[PDB]
């Protein structure tokens, strides 16, 4: 099991890494969308966590590129406070689920669990 976390804000990345570690996951962290676009398509991950708040190339364009390459990896997007549009647009772009910032770690855990469960058809 291995996750990719794409998160530019270091304090948030550090918190997410700690939380994901407490949940039992090995995680690779990338802060830059250019790096993430390549690595997400090239390296085996069970799940990618993609913050839509990345500077530079929009996260949703990165996600669309991945889907156009046939990437079937589960993607959980982190969306903006109060943005219903980002959740809808993110699903349309090919996200499997989302979590609205600021979020609670229990909800992070539950949504990741469910994606990983369905990905393997686990009970």
Swiss-Prot record:
Single annotated GO MF: transcription cis-regulatory region binding
Phenotypic consequence of gene deletion: Abolishes Ca(2+)-dependent induction of CarP.
One GO cellular component term: cytosol
Gene Ontology biological process terms, A to Z: regulation of DNA-templated transcription; response to calcium ion
Response regulatory domain ranges (all copies): 2-116
4-aspartylphosphate found at: 51
Keywords: DNA-binding, Phosphoprotein, Transcription, Transcription regulation, Two-component regulatory system
Protein function: Member of the two-component regulatory system CarS/CarR that regulates the expression of multiple genes involved in calcium signaling and homeostasis including CarO and CarP. May function as a transcriptional activator by direct binding to a cis-acting sequence upstream of the target gene promoters.
Name used for this protein in its record: Response regulator protein CarR
Source organism of the structure: Pseudomonas aeruginosa (strain ATCC 15692 / DSM 22644 / CIP 104116 / JCM 14847 / LMG 12228 / 1C / PRS 101 / PAO1)
